[PDB]
Design a protein around this ligand. Structure first.
Ligand SMILES: Nc1ncnc2c1ncn2[C@@H]1O[C@H](COP(=O)(O)OP(=O)(O)OP(=O)(O)O)[C@@H](O)[C@H]1O
Ligand SMILES: [Mg+2]
Lengths: 48, 463, 509, 464
């Protein structure tokens, strides 16, 4: 019982760490997507 | 006072006219060399116009004279088109000789007015288990078919065609919109061997023609359906007609193609800003009226199974049901192979369907979705370690899946082409009994590939 | 018979009284309801324009040599050479309490087939919000018939509150049901529909007529088959009609539909004007566009009322509550348009797809939906009784994970879990079944009294309905008095508890 | 002869022509002849052609209409009477209580403060709130990052700040509403009035019902107000040191993006104006102290999309000096204010700034509060009495700390009775140090709650 308890605690901690990781990468990707699309739009508008 | 070819770039065409004589929008322009025709898109002043080529894009010479008709695009309509396949221009493409009628009508009428909406919602039944229980239809409705590539979707539409034809003198009509012409020919011949073409009219846009043609096939089919509905027969009310869209997405893409070359700026995805305008123009001319109604079926394609972008988003704001086909249920050997858990309709309402049918649908949703989420743990341990509770649930879910297996009326060769078209009430009875457990003592196989309780019991007794 | 003949003749002799020296323009360019015209040197900004076909147009770009203007009616009837003409006026639409029971165009033109409308008054669609000095605080509540809504998310007369969520989430139903609850509020209501299937529109119309509430109500719809400009301007017109009564010292409610959609239309229009695009093609002023609309609705200081009336009315204060709706893509909040919207409202409400998919009707997620106006938008009794729900729902939502758990856990956790599960289920509700505040009151009392903390969850709704009917019959004067006032008193609660324990003692559920 | 005539109109941008011998400079002020709207020179288009923005609605206007200039940037009234008055960006009263009393007018723009005037020292503002006073001391002429949602008493904290600065340091208060929503603005007014503090503050709001230029320039408006008050010298020189309150600078950046887009200029990485940093700085450098007088800033900050790496907050942090964050749970725990005493960061947190002992004390408090925070989960799950008794002592001491950091407010006096208590350092420091010594481990936590200095705490404890 003790060992299972400790392992669950560690699992929770690793989950939190991975959550941080994913959140950071998500922010980066959202920024990149916005950049790409706005560049597309401005180029297309500049076409005329 | 004839215009001339002044500039051509790909799909966009321009013509000079005498400033006094100026064509109006949406009127046909006659190439004085070839049969090819031009539609006005916008007036460029000074007698200059912008147009799109209806037909081939060959044989074109800067400075070739072109004339007009000073009138919108009108094509023949009437019973003299049934069982015939026409081009975007309404010409015989089936080599069955010219059309017989001269009843020609334009294609850009306005949407039906507000005051003339059918003052009451209606319902349509198909005699099909999963649909008439979980995907109800309103006569005049809007239906979407998403995905499905391991099964014959055209088989499903043709089944619905036989459904409506035997169900009503209300004829049917299909329009080829970016048609995978292999499947189109297959459908043509299979309807042919069905001997059912008298209630069918055919126009094809088959991924080989300037984008305008594939744009406008939709309008053609719309016009045919409109007029055919408007033929008030012996009573003052014509038949309620059915439409088949080869793909709405290709209708969107047709305008999407040359929008930028039109001088249109791109949209949020780079699309055409007039997307919603044309979409509504299309849909609002598809309704139920005070006298008669028109409904349609739309074969839907989804890009990368992604719905979270405008191209399906706009469509969804006009449908009434989202029939999403299922592949692995087909792998389960199910004939219809339609998902029972994702497909919905806005028509699922007790006030319109009654209470009992609605609540039966509720219960079956609950049991199926609960059975799904236990799959993992069942795999991990087995049925035994689960409480005795939900064992009957598993059995009932399996029997439900079997009950959904509906032999097709018209395949001509899948199980003998047997029709079921079971009444909604009988299926209600059967599913009510199954939910209660009236027959939760029989192997699910007895519920497989059959219809009502009579067939299930007879099968269980014969084995 | 001969009556009209005299009528037409007498009318005619009233005309051609002189020759006009008007200044007008002519057509140079046409594309998709957008016209470049030449001439008309003098022109009001945003002047409404007339054309030889009887149609009308809206002038936006006053460039140094020409004019760009958008078709208001239906183009595909205009050709270069035809002559425009300004009206010497700005865009204006009629208002008036006679508009009740009437359905009109975004221009304010009947569509109900009920003939002409005798509006004695018309007004410019575009105006400005009153001086912030003419604002006084919000204290009168607005009822929704939704226990969760009316408890955790109070709504006060003149407040801007946002319903938001993903698609097919009953948002339309939420608005209309909120409308229904106005049998006794005495306020009037306006529904603004944008880009909709006339079928849906007519269904709403018919349903409202069944409720008969289309008598203190007016509605305009810019369906999907309408000129984009019509759609773009329509919410402003609805705001105009609301401001009519607001400035009459009256209190009312209005509802938009798909402000996102009209934003799309405006995007398209601006784009066709060759204006510089912004992010996601959105001209920046979309923030300005929406904001200049929303703030026009509020609750005003009665002093402003008095001075505007010039003595006509002195007692009341005008107000107008704003209930807009935004549809979202996969429940995002980071999209530019919603992001703009958020900082504008006085409070927001989310709809979660899973809950309705889980059959949670309604599917509101109270976990993020807030109303920063506080209890000032509740009645004293509800202001009193909300806290129990508040804290119980809190505790539940932190620790709801234990659903299958608590076969070995401490008992207090189990009891609190049962409490939470029951109260959570309590809010499941059907459309067109508004709860009077007395009904909500008896439900909350039974909740906090724990007299439902002893009954199975599957029949909580049945329990509640039975209780409802029981009081409704037995103790009608009590609820009468309650909803007359909405005050919490020891005598009142004692009577309520006596009735409850009687009901438990009496007929079962 | 400065009358020029309108030549072209789109949306909000406005174009006029003038004579090629008399051309206004950029940022000059144009008043439309016959109407009360004003135009702002943006870029010289040559040929006597100028492209400008308008200040308000643009309706009915028609080309060829005459407009004059002022040959100068915008000037607004400034003076002592400006308190208790709400004006627009143009410094024009909207309270509707008569015109502005002063005749003193100053142009809105001026260059950045001289390098020579940057004071060769850096010291700390005294406040009596007992929390920032230890953990995040403010510099003199600093920028304080503030975060958290509404309903946690933001207005209340501002109230107390104003009260203290005006009371002890005789500070004057200026508040700027960027992108304000009218209702909360009016509420804030009524609060200014009931709490007898209105007479000491100068108020200007820009609503989100106005074209962007209004919202952009209210900032510089309030800034100049503050500059005038500070540079207004006192007896023997040494003009006051003042505090500036500005809402949602992120809204400011957004409005800058607005006007840049309307000019037809390409976006930035995310899509902001490419010039973003320019205006950000131009705002910043005029926020500092001088050899005469000082200015300090409180700025409401909102982080859209929770992106600490977004360009706008990134540029913000380039000038941030201290960070203060507001909690929801802490307030729900009946502790006011709800300042999280664990996320607040101060550039001034150095033994070279607050001194050696003060620095170490603060670090020790931080350690204790951390230590207890990771203790919390174990206390919840595995009980309490299964740990080191020293850890339990830590628990009690940290609880006392948290109970103590809240205090009555002199603004809270009118709210709920209970007159507030002003407290400086050198008593907070001593009391906290003694608490760290554990010499008060014989007293319940109650004596620390809603109370002033440690002497008061012991008075209550004896009386409890
Ligand atoms: N509490 C309820 N009980 C029963 N049915 C409900 C309830 N709430 C909503 N519904 C049903 O759900 C259906 C769909 O809701 P609705 O059409 O209002 O969603 P929507 O978001 O407005 O759709 P769209 O996004 O297309 O505008 C309605 O037809 C309504 O009958
Ligand atoms: Mg809706």
């Amino acid at each position: 019982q003790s060992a299972r308890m400790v392992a669950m605690k560690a699992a929770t901690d690793n989950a939190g760490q991975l959550i941080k990781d994913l959140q950071l990468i998500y922010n980066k990707l959202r920024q990149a997507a916005i950049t790409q699309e706005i560049s597309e739009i401005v180029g297309g508008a500049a076409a005329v | 006072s004839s215009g001339r070819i002044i500039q051509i770039i790909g799909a966009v065409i321009d013509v000079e006219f005498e400033r006094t004589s100026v064509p109006k929008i949406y009127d046909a322009l006659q190439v004085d060399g070839t049969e090819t025709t031009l539609e006005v898109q916008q007036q460029l002043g000074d007698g200059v116009v912008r147009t799109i080529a209806m037909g081939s894009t060959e044989g074109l010479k800067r400075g070739l004279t072109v004339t007009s008709t000073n009138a919108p695009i009108s094509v023949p309509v009437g019973t003299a088109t049934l069982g015939r396949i026409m081009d975007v221009l309404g010409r015989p493409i089936d080599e069955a000789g010219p059309v017989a009628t001269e009843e020609r009508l334009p294609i850009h009428r306005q949407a039906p007015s507000y005051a003339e909406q059918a003052a009451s919602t209606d319902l349509l039944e198909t005699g099909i288990k999963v649909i008439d229980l979980l995907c109800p239809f309103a006569k005049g409705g809007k239906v979407g078919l998403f995905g499905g590539a391991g099964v014959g979707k055209t088989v499903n539409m043709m089944e619905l065609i036989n459904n409506i034809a035997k169900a009503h003198s209300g004829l049917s009509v299909f329009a080829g919109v970016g048609e995978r012409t292999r499947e189109g020919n297959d459908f043509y011949h299979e309807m042919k061997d069905s001997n059912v073409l008298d209630k069918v009219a055919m126009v094809y846009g088959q991924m080989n023609e300037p984008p305008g043609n594939r744009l406008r096939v939709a309008l053609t089919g719309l016009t045919m359906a409109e007029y055919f509905r408007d033929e008030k027969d012996e009573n003052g009310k014509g038949r309620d007609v059915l439409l088949f869209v080869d793909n709405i997405y290709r209708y969107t893409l047709a305008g999407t193609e040359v929008s930028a070359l039109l001088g249109r700026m791109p949209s949020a995805v780079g699309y055409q800003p007039t997307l919603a305008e044309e979409m509504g123009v299309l849909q609002e001319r598809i309704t139920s009226t005070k006298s008669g109604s028109i409904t349609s079926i739309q074969a839907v394609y989804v890009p990368a199974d992604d719905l979270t972008d405008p191209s399906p988003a706009t469509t969804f704001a006009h449908l009434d049901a989202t029939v999403v086909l299922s592949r692995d249920i087909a792998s389960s050997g199910i004939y219809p192979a339609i998902d029972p858990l994702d497909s919905t309709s806005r028509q699922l309402d007790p006030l319109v369907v009654g209470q009992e049918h609605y609540e039966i649908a509720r219960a079956v949703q609950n049991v199926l979705q609960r059975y799904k989420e236990l799959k993992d743990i069942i795999a991990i341990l087995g049925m035994d370690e689960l409480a005795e509770e939900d064992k009957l649930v598993v059995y009932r879910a399996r029997k439900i899946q079997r009950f959904f297996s509906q032999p097709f009326h018209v395949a001509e060769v899948f199980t003998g082409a047997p029709g079921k078209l079971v009444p909604l009430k009988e299926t209600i009875r059967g599913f009510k009994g199954l939910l209660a457990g009236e027959y939760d003592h029989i192997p699910e196989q007895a519920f497989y590939m059959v219809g009502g309780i009579d067939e299930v019991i007879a099968k269980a007794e014969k084995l | 018979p001969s009556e009209i003949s005299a009528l037409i003749k007498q009318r005619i002799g009233d005309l051609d009284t002189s020759a006009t020296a008007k200044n007008e323009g002519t057509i140079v360019m046409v594309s998709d309801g957008i016209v470049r015209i030449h001439g008309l040197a003098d022109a009001m900004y945003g002047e409404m324009i007339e054309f030889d076909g009887g149609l009308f147009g809206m002038a936006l770009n006053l460039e140094q040599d020409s004019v760009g203007a958008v078709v208001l009616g239906n183009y595909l009837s205009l050709q270069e050479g035809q002559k425009a003409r300004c009206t010497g006026r700005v865009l204006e639409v009629p208002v008036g309490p006679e508009l009740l029971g009437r359905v009109v165009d975004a221009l304010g033109n009947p569509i109900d087939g009920k003939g002409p409308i005798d509006a004695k008054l018309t007004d410019a669609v575009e105006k400005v919000a009153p001086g912030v000095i003419w604002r006084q605080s919000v204290d009168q509540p607005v009822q929704t018939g939704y226990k969760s809504v009316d408890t955790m998310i109070p709504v006060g007369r003149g407040q801007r509150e946002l319903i938001i969520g993903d698609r097919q989430t009953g948002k339309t139903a939420m608005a209309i049901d909120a409308i229904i609850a106005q049998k006794n509020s005495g306020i009037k209501c306006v529904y603004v529909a944008i880009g909709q299937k006339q079928s849906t529109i007519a269904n709403v119309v018919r349903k409202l007529e069944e409720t008969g509430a289309m008598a203190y109500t007016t509605v305009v719809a810019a369906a999907a088959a309408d000129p984009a400009a019509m759609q773009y301007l329509a919410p402003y017109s609805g705001c105009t009609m609301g401001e009519y009564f607001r400035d009459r010292g009256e209190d009312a409610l209005i509802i938009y539909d798909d402000l996102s959609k009209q934003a799309v239309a405006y995007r398209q229009i601006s784009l066709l004007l060759r204006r510089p695009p912004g992010r996601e093609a959105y001209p920046g002023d979309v923030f300005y566009l929406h904001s200049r609309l929303l703030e026009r609705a509020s609750r005003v200081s009665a002093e402003y009322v008095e001075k505007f009336t010039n003595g006509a009315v002195t007692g009341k204060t005008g107000s107008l509550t704003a209930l807009p709706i935004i549809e979202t893509q996969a429940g995002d909040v980071s999209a530019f348009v919603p992001t703009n919207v958020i900082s504008i409202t006085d409070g927001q409400i989310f709809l979660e797809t899973s809950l309705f998919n889980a059959g949670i009707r309604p599917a509101v997620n109270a976990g993020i939906s807030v109303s920063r106006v506080g209890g000032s938008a509740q009645t004293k009794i509800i202001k009193k009784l909300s806290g129990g729900i508040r804290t119980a729902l809190a505790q539940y939502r932190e620790l709801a994970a234990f659903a299958q758990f608590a076969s070995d856990l401490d008992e207090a956790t189990r009891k609190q879990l049962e409490h939470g599960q029951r109260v959570t289920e309590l809010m499941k509700q059907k459309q067109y079944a508004p709860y009077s505040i007395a009904d909500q009151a008896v439900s909350v009392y039974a909740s906090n009294e724990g007299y439902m903390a002893d009954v199975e969850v599957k029949k909580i709704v049945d329990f509640d309905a039975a209780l409802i009917a029981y009081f409704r019959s037995e103790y009608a004067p009590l609820m009468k008095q309650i909803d007359e006032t909405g005050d919490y008193n020891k005598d009142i609660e004692a009577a309520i508890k006596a009735g409850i324990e009687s009901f438990k003692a009496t007929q079962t559920y």
